[PDB]
Write an enzyme that holds these catalytic residues in place. Structure first.
Site, PDB file in Angstrom:
ATOM      1  N   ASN A 164      65.916  17.190  15.962  1.00  0.00           N
ATOM      2  CA  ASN A 164      65.129  17.725  14.843  1.00  0.00           C
ATOM      3  C   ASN A 164      64.582  16.623  13.960  1.00  0.00           C
ATOM      4  O   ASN A 164      64.210  16.857  12.800  1.00  0.00           O
ATOM      5  CB  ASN A 164      65.849  18.807  14.045  1.00  0.00           C
ATOM      6  CG  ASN A 164      67.174  18.395  13.541  1.00  0.00           C
ATOM      7  OD1 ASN A 164      67.349  17.239  13.121  1.00  0.00           O
ATOM      8  ND2 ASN A 164      68.129  19.357  13.513  1.00  0.00           N
ATOM      9  N   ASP A 171      59.966  14.401  19.913  1.00  0.00           N
ATOM     10  CA  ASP A 171      61.173  14.283  19.092  1.00  0.00           C
ATOM     11  C   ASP A 171      61.805  12.887  19.298  1.00  0.00           C
ATOM     12  O   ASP A 171      61.460  12.145  20.239  1.00  0.00           O
ATOM     13  CB  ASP A 171      62.175  15.412  19.361  1.00  0.00           C
ATOM     14  CG  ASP A 171      62.752  15.462  20.758  1.00  0.00           C
ATOM     15  OD1 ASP A 171      62.300  14.682  21.621  1.00  0.00           O
ATOM     16  OD2 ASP A 171      63.617  16.294  20.993  1.00  0.00           O
ATOM     17  N   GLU A 192      65.672  24.552  21.576  1.00  0.00           N
ATOM     18  CA  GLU A 192      66.650  25.611  21.364  1.00  0.00           C
ATOM     19  C   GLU A 192      67.655  25.103  20.351  1.00  0.00           C
ATOM     20  O   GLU A 192      68.451  24.216  20.667  1.00  0.00           O
ATOM     21  CB  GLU A 192      67.349  26.031  22.681  1.00  0.00           C
ATOM     22  CG  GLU A 192      66.429  26.608  23.744  1.00  0.00           C
ATOM     23  CD  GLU A 192      66.813  27.965  24.300  1.00  0.00           C
ATOM     24  OE1 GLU A 192      66.831  28.947  23.522  1.00  0.00           O
ATOM     25  OE2 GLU A 192      67.017  28.060  25.531  1.00  0.00           O
ATOM     26  N   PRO A 242      68.934  13.999  16.761  1.00  0.00           N
ATOM     27  CA  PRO A 242      67.668  13.475  17.302  1.00  0.00           C
ATOM     28  C   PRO A 242      66.645  14.553  17.681  1.00  0.00           C
ATOM     29  O   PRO A 242      65.446  14.303  17.581  1.00  0.00           O
ATOM     30  CB  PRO A 242      68.124  12.671  18.521  1.00  0.00           C
ATOM     31  CG  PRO A 242      69.498  12.151  18.097  1.00  0.00           C
ATOM     32  CD  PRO A 242      70.104  13.404  17.448  1.00  0.00           C
ATOM     33  N   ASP A 267      72.311  19.751   9.512  1.00  0.00           N
ATOM     34  CA  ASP A 267      72.444  19.655  10.962  1.00  0.00           C
ATOM     35  C   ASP A 267      71.468  18.647  11.546  1.00  0.00           C
ATOM     36  O   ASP A 267      70.818  18.922  12.577  1.00  0.00           O
ATOM     37  CB  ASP A 267      72.289  21.038  11.641  1.00  0.00           C
ATOM     38  CG  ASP A 267      72.677  21.056  13.123  1.00  0.00           C
ATOM     39  OD1 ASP A 267      73.526  20.203  13.540  1.00  0.00           O
ATOM     40  OD2 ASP A 267      72.074  21.851  13.883  1.00  0.00           O
ATOM     41  N   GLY A 308      67.892  29.627  16.870  1.00  0.00           N
ATOM     42  CA  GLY A 308      66.550  29.954  17.332  1.00  0.00           C
ATOM     43  C   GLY A 308      65.981  29.098  18.446  1.00  0.00           C
ATOM     44  O   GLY A 308      66.378  27.943  18.617  1.00  0.00           O
TER      45      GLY A 308
HETATM   46  C1  LIG Z   1      64.578  21.709  17.676  1.00  0.00           C
HETATM   47  C2  LIG Z   1      63.271  21.716  16.957  1.00  0.00           C
HETATM   48  N1  LIG Z   1      63.044  22.370  15.853  1.00  0.00           N
HETATM   49  C3  LIG Z   1      61.732  22.254  15.425  1.00  0.00           C
HETATM   50  C4  LIG Z   1      61.286  23.036  14.235  1.00  0.00           C
HETATM   51  C5  LIG Z   1      60.946  21.437  16.242  1.00  0.00           C
HETATM   52  C6  LIG Z   1      59.578  20.894  16.138  1.00  0.00           C
HETATM   53  C7  LIG Z   1      58.801  20.982  14.991  1.00  0.00           C
HETATM   54  C8  LIG Z   1      57.566  20.363  15.064  1.00  0.00           C
HETATM   55  N2  LIG Z   1      57.099  19.739  16.155  1.00  0.00           N
HETATM   56  C9  LIG Z   1      57.928  19.709  17.204  1.00  0.00           C
HETATM   57  N3  LIG Z   1      57.471  19.054  18.292  1.00  0.00           N
HETATM   58  C10 LIG Z   1      58.082  18.702  19.510  1.00  0.00           C
HETATM   59  C11 LIG Z   1      59.450  18.782  19.746  1.00  0.00           C
HETATM   60  C12 LIG Z   1      59.969  18.478  20.992  1.00  0.00           C
HETATM   61  C13 LIG Z   1      59.125  18.099  22.024  1.00  0.00           C
HETATM   62  N4  LIG Z   1      59.696  17.681  23.331  1.00  0.00           N
HETATM   63  C14 LIG Z   1      59.672  16.201  23.514  1.00  0.00           C
HETATM   64  C15 LIG Z   1      61.055  18.236  23.596  1.00  0.00           C
HETATM   65  C16 LIG Z   1      57.773  18.027  21.779  1.00  0.00           C
HETATM   66 CL1  LIG Z   1      56.671  17.683  23.063  1.00  0.00          CL
HETATM   67  C17 LIG Z   1      57.242  18.293  20.537  1.00  0.00           C
HETATM   68  N5  LIG Z   1      59.160  20.274  17.252  1.00  0.00           N
HETATM   69  S1  LIG Z   1      61.894  20.863  17.586  1.00  0.00           S
END
Ligand SMILES: Cc1nc(C)c(-c2ccnc(Nc3ccc(N(C)C)c(Cl)c3)n2)s1
Length: 291
Positions: A125, A79, A12, A123, A120, A16
């Site tokens: 992003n 992340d 979140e 950790p 912005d 978005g």
């Molecule tokens: C705040 C974010 N914005 C974007 C665009 C995000 C993004 C983009 C590409 N891959 C991912 N993977 C991912 C993120 C968080 C998690 N768990 C650990 C919270 C996982 Cl399991 C995968 N997240 S996360």
């Protein structure tokens, strides 16, 4: 959106909610950002689809349909926030911290060379994979749009990585804001504690002042004329970095101090940081990831 099947919520942001989803046409898993609702925004976000680098999460598609804007990103497996939490007892090995900082400086030097700012970094992003890569995700525009997530969830905007020029009311800030955020994240990887965990704009600013000293015209020419500067700010003396980031060596402490200069014009650039002696012995280690 009929072509995507949501798997689970993964984040979140400020404007978005992000889901892990499956592309029914290709079978690929993606990160889908849903923004609840501007033509200038569609054009500017479409320009980000061209901004491709190994240390930038690929923006695969921009889907504009039924008063919502969907951003389709490549999916990364974790992340940096989860990795830091998972590594809280042991700490992330210093060679891996150095690799991640080097790669994120490469990503920033690339987008800053194309006059693209993140604005912005945090950790949540910064995304990692099992090969040892780390990537920057979801670059922000100078003009914000859509319903903020805080109005329909229990989520709050984190101020911890915000550059002091933004907190002091500079609306025409530079690429230096991303170097500040990255310096804050570097210190947090090393110490396993956020550097400046403010929970209000003034608490955030005064936490910065208590560690780096209240800025004045000597260290930051023009600071006293900034929009939100008050002569009534308390005057705190600066602390030593030896106290702020133990057990970082002198090359890492010198680099961090250059990333945290108050004057954005004195703050090191990503390109100059890549040449810093701290990276003389940089390597690309494998993280131990629990997925
Ligand atoms: C705040 C974010 N914005 C974007 C665009 C995000 C993004 C983009 C590409 N891959 C991912 N993977 C991912 C993120 C968080 C998690 N768990 C650990 C919270 C996982 Cl399991 C995968 N997240 S996360």
């Amino acid at each position: 959106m009929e072509n995507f099947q949501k798997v689970e919520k993964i984040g979140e942001g400020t404007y978005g909610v992000v889901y892990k989803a499956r592309n029914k046409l290709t079978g690929e898993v993606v990160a889908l950002k849903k923004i609840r609702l501007p033509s200038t925004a569609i054009r500017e976000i479409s320009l980000l689809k061209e901004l491709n680098h190994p240390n930038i999460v690929k923006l695969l598609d921009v889907i504009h349909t039924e008063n919502k804007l969907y951003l389709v990103f490549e999916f990364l497996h974790q992340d940096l926030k989860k990795f830091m939490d998972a590594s809280a007892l042991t700490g992330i090995p210093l060679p891996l911290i150095k690799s991640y900082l080097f790669q994120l400086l490469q990503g920033l030097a690339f987008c800053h060379s194309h006059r693209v700012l993140h604005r912005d970094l945090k950790p949540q992003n910064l995304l990692i994979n099992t090969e040892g890569a780390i990537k920057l995700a979801d670059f922000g525009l100078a003009r914000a749009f859509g319903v903020p997530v805080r109005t329909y969830t229990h989520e709050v905007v984190t101020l911890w990585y915000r550059a002091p020029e933004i907190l002091l009311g500079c609306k025409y800030y530079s690429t230096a804001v991303d170097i500040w955020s990255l310096g804050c994240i570097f210190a947090e990887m090393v110490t396993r504690r956020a550097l400046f965990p403010g929970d209000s704009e003034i608490d955030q600013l005064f936490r910065i002042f208590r560690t780096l000293g209240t800025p004045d015209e000597v260290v930051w020419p023009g600071v006293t004329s900034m929009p939100d500067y008050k002569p009534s700010f308390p005057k705190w003396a600066r602390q030593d970095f030896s106290k702020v980031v133990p057990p970082l060596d002198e090359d890492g402490r010198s680099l961090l101090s250059q990333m945290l200069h108050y004057d954005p014009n004195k703050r090191i650039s990503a390109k100059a940081a890549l040449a810093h002696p701290f990276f003389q012995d940089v390597t690309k280690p494998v993280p131990h990831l629990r997925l």
